[PDB]
Amino acid sequence: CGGPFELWEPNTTFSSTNFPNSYPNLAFCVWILNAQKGKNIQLHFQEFDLENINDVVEIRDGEEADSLLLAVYTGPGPVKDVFSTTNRMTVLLITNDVLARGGFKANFTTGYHLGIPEPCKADHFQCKNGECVPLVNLCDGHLHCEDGSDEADCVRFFNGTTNNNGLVRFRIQSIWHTACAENWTTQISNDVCQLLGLGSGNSSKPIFPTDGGPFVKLNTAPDGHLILTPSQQCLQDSLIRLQCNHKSCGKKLAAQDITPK
Amino acid sequence: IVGGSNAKEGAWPWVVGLYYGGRLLCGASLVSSDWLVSAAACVYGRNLEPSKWTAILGLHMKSNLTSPQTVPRLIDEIVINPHYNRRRKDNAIAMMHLEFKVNYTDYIQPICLPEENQVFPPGRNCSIAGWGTVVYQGTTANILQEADVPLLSNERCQQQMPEYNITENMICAGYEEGGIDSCQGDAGGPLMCQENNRWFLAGVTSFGYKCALPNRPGVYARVSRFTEWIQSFLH
């Protein structure tokens, strides 16, 4: 309850309260590891052996009253390192009153962009896992980046205030733009419904051509994937005002009866 | 839930139970075919070993588990809310990813998430589900107990619950005279409130001061403030 407190750059290596023996029960310590402005924090563990879920380490990244969370470590084993974002990594210890363990150690060396891999510039799209894919998987129908960021949502709506409504805003690889409805059918309608995470198309109809952006030509084929071609040759273009209903949400699908008793 | 009634088999397909090493600990509400939503008060300190967790989908009777409607699944990823705080009891929600996808059967259906700019008015009759405990100092029930619980205002809840700082991100629901409220062993139970012939997720069972007590309702996590956060993991 009255252990160590905020440290700085020189003092790095520190135990919780007592390394050669066990920590006292009912203890609530705190180590507010700080650094200079613009520097992140690193929390590699050289030794870590604590009790079960009853004893955890609520690693915080607050810097203010609205504290965030980074990791909650417990039990034995070489737990993974923690890489904060702000320059104030708060470490709160919460222990029970039964079967206290030895302790742990932490060597926090600050720096810049520790943990997060350096993104590759010069036309190299960096998916959220650190992998680089310049143009091979820029929303083309592949799953190279295992986190799904390579095939992430490159489609959205426009003036679509509610949930399942809006324009036909489409991004081929880089630029967002609309499309055309010269060959628009219910098949591709439900296809783009499912691609947008929605139900089936209710009523698809255009309104008027608003902008002269590089609209795309939507087509159909038995290969499953829709054919797209961003050709800027279309007079009085019909911008799709897609009205897609929602998917099968939490409605009673079983064959229940009516027994009000 | 203490004063709950036995629910019809299939009336709540989006209410599953989370087993922690062969033992039911807390309940969860299935939102997508691979991502669940449960209270962070149970996965706190247990997310390091997701393989130990296991979620039975479409479970109605624990003893009647040999039925083909119950599809077991293994957990491989747990994501706790970043703004979680165990001391202040704020934002106690955490999603759980599934190993393999599951088909939407007759007894397995996804729940609807509350959209933004949609407030639930207090005093609205809508029930909950989950393995409610019949008696505080006893054991839970094998059947899915359920009962209607009206919604209350945040100001009235703060006046009735001065022990906890009730913020905007929490919504309470409980009888004025008590008797029927969520109890232990049912953390993470969904606050399913019907809206236009469709049930939503208007709250997650975070905790409870004293279940089945007058003027002592249960505080639920307001899911309407975390719609985009949950939807960011559904894809």
Ligand SMILES: *[C@@H]1O[C@H](CO)[C@@H](O)[C@H](O)[C@H]1NC(C)=O
């Ligand atoms: C580091 O620890 C020493 C020893 O207790 C202390 O005197 C000093 O104030 C600490 N902080 C520094 C050197 O920035």
Ligand SMILES: *[C@@H]1O[C@H](CO)[C@@H](O)[C@H](O)[C@H]1NC(C)=O
């Ligand atoms: C901290 O000390 C450990 C001890 O071996 C060392 O391996 C590590 O590189 C040091 N710096 C860190 C963890 O930033």
Ligand SMILES: *[C@@H]1O[C@H](CO)[C@@H](O)[C@H](O)[C@H]1NC(C)=O
């Ligand atoms: C969408 O709304 C904006 C409001 O600023 C307007 O300028 C634009 O023309 C609208 N577009 C369509 C397609 O309605």
Ligand SMILES: *[C@@H]1O[C@H](CO)[C@@H](O)[C@H](O)[C@H]1NC(C)=O
């Ligand atoms: C699209 O519609 C035009 C006009 O009806 C027609 O000439 C063309 O063959 C259609 N293309 C496809 C792929 O259906």
Ligand SMILES: *[C@@H]1O[C@H](CO)[C@@H](O)[C@H](O)[C@H]1NC(C)=O
């Ligand atoms: C389309 O929306 C209307 C809303 O009034 C609804 O009645 C109708 O069932 C919907 N149709 C489909 C196919 O979703």
Ligand SMILES: *[C@@H]1O[C@H](CO)[C@@H](O)[C@H](O)[C@H]1NC(C)=O
């Ligand atoms: C469920 O219960 C019934 C009767 O209580 C029994 O016949 C059956 O074997 C049980 N298990 C199932 C249906 O998987």
Ligand SMILES: *[C@@H]1O[C@H](CO)[C@@H](O)[C@H](O)[C@H]1NC(C)=O
């Ligand atoms: C689900 O449906 C697919 C076909 O759409 C089928 O191959 C599969 O066996 C079904 N069951 C599961 C558990 O995926």
Ligand SMILES: *[C@@H]1O[C@H](CO)[C@@H](O)[C@H](O)[C@H]1NC(C)=O
């Ligand atoms: C809600 O249900 C309770 C009993 O379940 C009943 O006494 C009460 O009148 C109901 N309120 C409304 C507004 O339907």
Ligand SMILES: *[C@@H]1O[C@H](CO)[C@@H](O)[C@H](O)[C@H]1NC(C)=O
């Ligand atoms: C709740 O927290 C707010 C924010 O610090 C504070 O202003 C308020 O006094 C607190 N209320 C209670 C009852 O603790």
